[PDB]
């Protein structure tokens, strides 16, 4: 186990892009790889620790593969919702992503409103995350905060979800 | 199409300098390469994402090519005048350039006053944007701001342009 | 002598992890390597300067070896305690670690209470260093300060131990 | 000429360390190399622009050669004092050096008080400038400012030397 997740993380980015472009295009390999990450104790938090430390373009290429293959995004965020603490590990890496990555994540959700709402329901069903999530937004810089407001109200129903919390 | 721009972006910097140098040394290749970026849906925002995430020295070498080869700078900021989200996307990635890169970009424009004024007109001829440009001065470190001030005061005309708004 | 520590620092990170994964799995090599670093004049400062500048995953992985091999963690902070000024250089690089590394370091100590208290003793034992540790903990992002309190409060004894100082 | 400084800057760090460890051990090569940088129009500001963007350990290893070969440090701060902008191109990169590098630079001068005095006089002999040095130390982290004050207290003569301006 452990040597695989470091071997992956220390490949050159082109090989990691190729590895993920194989994996999340084949549901039969995706499903069982996330079984491997939960069969070894805590190993899903070692895969996510390695993930958030990647070159930021590989992180956006990964979220671009999931959001555009949404038959696997709802399942992926079911693993991190079922496993306690992993949702808090997500947000406390999301706050630290270099801001182009936060912008591309935000675009990818507001441009696919089903996958925004489904993600936003998991922040209720993993308990107590919303006060931290509101604080993440509140600690962003004034440029990103202004731009996210101007971007979000391109769909005022998602503005209402953001007001409902 | 898109995998070419990833392949390009993941090359070692010397290959990208060599590619961008051979590209903009040939106006007949420059024009059509941007037609390829503009005809594929949305793809120019994916090339520009890959640009702002480059090694900082390749970003200055690229601007150092255009401004000192300016018969292609006049065309380049025409493409970003055409596409209404792209000028917003430029400034809100400019603010996230390294302070040494912002300093060198400002030197590069103020030392070529025609190409300063042309860029400054595009901020008015594109919708909105100009209040982002002002705040993206005002949000910088006090040392950077004093330096960029003591730089621009060399030209009372370019001082008049920035102070007219 | 000095060339070994630069050659090591400039190897690709997999070779460094291989080198450390051998070294602190062999106590007969561990004690010899650190004796060479204490004996050559100032070389223990040059190994630690090269350590805090590493790729953040090699830094996490190194602490992940020591804390789980505590028969060597005991010795390691004995060497720094027997080299006055090194405990200053420790904290004054810890404050500059990437937040994901500080978070994992804290996690590794509170999940191994003996090795938290052992570390905490040397903050008294190196003359007056404790005040710099308290001050550094006050100088972190406000959501990370609350996250470290929420994490530490999982053990009320160690929660008491940081409050009784 | 100009392409040499990019070919150099894009070599792997071991080659740059080798190239510099050859150069500032041979005064006959050192004076010639900087004469080329002085003669080609603006090229010394292109070398310094490439220098301050280096991997931070190469920046320290370079100053660690000069200060310990001070018979070449005296000449080096003729060049950067003679071009009237170049001293500002030091300080407006020095404020942007990573904090561990600024600490190791400061330590390296405080351990050689005559080379500290030599550098400090060149700030006054280059036009104006000294108020930027006072501002730079006032803008560092509170931990760094406190630590540099306690580090400089190791030499009361240099405490007087920084107080007398």
Residue numbers in the entry:
A (entry chain E): 333 to 497
B (entry chain G): 499 to 663
C (entry chain C): 167 to 331
D (entry chain A): 1 to 165
Paste lines from the article:
Here we describe a systematic approach to generating modular and rigid repeat protein oligomers with coincident C2 to C8 and superhelical symmetry axes that can be readily extended by repeat propagation. From these building blocks, we demonstrate that a wide range of unbounded fibres can be systematically designed by introducing hydrophilic surface patches that force staggering of the monomers; the geometry of such fibres can be precisely tuned by varying the number of repeat units in the monomer and the placement of the hydrophilic patches.
C4HR1_4r was solved at 3.3 Å by X-ray crystallography and ~3.7 Å by cryoEM; the two experimental structures are very close to the design model and to each other (r.m.s.d. values of 1.46 Å and 1.38 Å, respectively) with triangular-shaped repeat monomers with inner cavities lined by phenylalanines.
